[PDB]
Amino acid sequence: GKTITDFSISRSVLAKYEVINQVDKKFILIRCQSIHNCLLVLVDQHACDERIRLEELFYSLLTEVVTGTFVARDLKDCCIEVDRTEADLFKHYQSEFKKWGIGYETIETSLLEIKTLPEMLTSKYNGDKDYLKMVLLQHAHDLKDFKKLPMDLSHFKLYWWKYSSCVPTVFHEILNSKACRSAVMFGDELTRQECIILISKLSRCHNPFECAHGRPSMVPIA
């Protein structure tokens, strides 16, 4: 069997590096024999820590969903007014929303009765029926418009990133904000040992080259 040569070059880059030290309390300076295309790289400490945290959160979320252990907290006094086309869309995707803890029933002018929600979404919603409708509609439309593929549980190691694309936008935004807020900031003091641990964890990431908001985590400076 054959593969594509360019896929392995990115992974091998970060494995051939060593930490020099923290720079301007914002970056981690790293250094790369066999330096044909690869020397000095400045890593944003915030972006780095945020990426480590994001993939831990994404692994926990998809492990819970794939194994059917994802918590679905019961919700009371939650009925949202929907159009006929909206009710049809929700009736069609009821089985798909159940996978993410979003449990509902379609009445009839029609009304969407939300029975259960994941803890993550219960927090974000905070009684706002308008927000919850908009958020559930966004996913239903994403599925309908082939922007999001449905969660296939026919397959069952758990490689979370193979199911990363199925994750609804609202869950993605929550996980990005949680990882961002938990991460080390600019101006924060890091010891050389702390920098070594961060770059070590980063090199084991599925996507070490960007932060939680699609911007680079590092820049070459040599």
């Binding site: 069997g1 054959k2 593969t3 594509i4 360019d6 896929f7 990115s10 992974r11 086309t85 069609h92 082939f146 922007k147 593929l149 449905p150 990133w161 193979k162 990363s164 694309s165 599925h206 996507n207 960007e210 908001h213 699609g214 911007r215 680079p216």
Partner: protein, 260 residues
């Protein structure tokens, strides 16, 4: 001259498709009789199989069709060549989420880094006028030609580049290649034509005329290009069973008008 593809990622993606094909559902498509468009917004059309009338989600069927042509014709695509110029940095200006240069350039970089792969395996030709550093001058020269006589609508092109960087996982061969096929399929599917109230006197004669012309275009496209292709080579996957609904059994209708 057809090039042999021996990639394990492509072999496993083809097995996934082959295993998903629903034999009875494919037979309905293989022997279809296209009637016409039912809904341009919800992308619904009517077909006849045997003496039964079916409601089809053509947007869903075309998605699966173009993904399948993509897998079958992988690394063997014809090119659609593009006064008029196409700059990726200009296309991404439509998105308010990409307010900064770093966010826009990250998308272009991911694509531009794998330009040799995209041109060889997908015929997605990316050319840059200046040096490799300048992402602002990165242009799109050509796109794959999945179907002879069919040119995809470039309305969805700014979304194709955006999703190529943001939605595609470039860190895994199988997920990357599968993702690129899904983005081509989504770009290639015929556009939704949202409902405009023709009876509304407030709307201009230009908006009413263009809505009619957009409706005529999709009708002409499905009849002369898309459905003959769906009938010729579409293999229906099991998950499309909900996108194929029987709306009439014509023998039951004959009795209603039998004695005139």
């Amino acid at each position: 001259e057809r090039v042999n593809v021996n990639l394990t990622s492509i072999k496993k993606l083809r097995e996934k498709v082959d295993d998903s094909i629903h034999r009875e559902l494919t037979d309905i498509f293989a022997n279809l009789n296209y009637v016409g468009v039912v809904d341009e917004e919800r992308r619904l059309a009517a077909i006849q199989h045997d003496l039964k009338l079916f409601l089809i989600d053509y947007g869903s069927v075309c998605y699966e069709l173009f993904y399948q042509i993509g897998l079958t014709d992988f690394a063997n695509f014809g090119k659609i060549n593009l006064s008029d110029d196409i700059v990726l940095y200009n296309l991404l200006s439509e998105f308010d989420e990409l307010n900064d240069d770093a966010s826009k350039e990250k998308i272009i970089s991911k694509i531009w880094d794998m330009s040799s792969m995209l041109n060889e395996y997908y015929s997605i030709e990316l050319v840059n006028d200046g040096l490799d550093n300048d992402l602002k001058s990165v242009k799109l020269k050509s796109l794959p030609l999945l179907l002879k006589g069919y040119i995809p609508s470039l309305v969805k092109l700014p979304f194709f580049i955006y999703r190529l960087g943001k939605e595609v996982d470039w860190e895994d061969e199988q997920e990357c290649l599968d993702g690129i096929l899904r983005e081509i399929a989504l770009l290639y599917i015929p556009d939704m034509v949202p409902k405009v109230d023709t009876s509304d006197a407030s709307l201009s004669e230009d908006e009413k005329a263009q809505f009619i012309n957009r409706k005529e275009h999709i009708s002409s496209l499905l009849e002369h290009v898309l459905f003959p292709c769906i009938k010729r080579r579409f293999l229906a996957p099991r998950h499309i069973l909900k996108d194929v609904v029987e709306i009439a059994n014509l023998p039951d209708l004959y009795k209603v008008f039998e004695r005139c």
